[PDB]
Design a protein around this ligand. Structure first.
Ligand code: A1AQA
Ligand code: CL
Ligand code: CL
Length: 163
């Protein structure tokens, strides 16, 4: 565990993270995909051997000894708001199980279903709150990666609000 488990946010490419493992915003087919998933594929392509897993699940594949937790958020283009909300919360619960099982002291994590799976809606608060619901009972340091300057501020505010 971390001595004083924290949440932090950084605005940069999660492929450059300084944590003991990474969460991929994966597709269910284990394809290279786009956005975070493509960055992860370029940095850790070995981790896509048999990474395919259903929506709402996480499957970890090692790249060397570096764990890549492939977490499949729902595509809100395809799901109802109700069903997509349930699967998004479920994917984060599976991430917390994997982080715990791996025994890491830190994890780099993107906000699932906030990019091309968002159905064109702003889901920062929805996705971040499901992240907190899942990760709050873990003792790993969590570092959230984003790319948008306004999202960095909003994520940082939500972290600081609870301290
Ligand atoms: C998926 C995007 C684009 C479509 C509208 C919804 N949307 C955002 O609000 C957003 C997400 N992530 C970072 C910055 N903005
Ligand atoms: Cl960067
Ligand atoms: Cl996404």
């Amino acid at each position: 565990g971390a001595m004083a488990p924290s949440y932090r946010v950084k605005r940069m490419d999660i492929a450059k993270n300084d944590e003991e493992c990474v969460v991929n915003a994966a597709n269910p087919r284990g394809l290279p995909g786009d956005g975070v998933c493509k960055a992860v594929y370029k940095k850790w392509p070995e981790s896509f051997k048999n990474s395919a897993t259903p929506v709402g699940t996480a499957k970890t594949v090692m790249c060397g000894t570096y764990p890549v937790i492939h977490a499949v958020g729902p595509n809100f283009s395809n799901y109802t708001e109700s069903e997509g909300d349930r699967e998004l919360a479920a994917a984060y619960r599976e991430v917390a199980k994997e982080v715990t099982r791996l025994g890491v002291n830190s994890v780099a994590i993107p906000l699932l279903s906030t990019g091309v799976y968002s159905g064109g809606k702003d889901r920062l608060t929805q996705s971040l709150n499901h992240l907190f619901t899942a990760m709050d009972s873990t003792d790993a340091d969590v570092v959230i990666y984003c790319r948008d300057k306004e999202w960095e501020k909003k994520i940082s505010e939500a972290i600081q609000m609870r301290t």
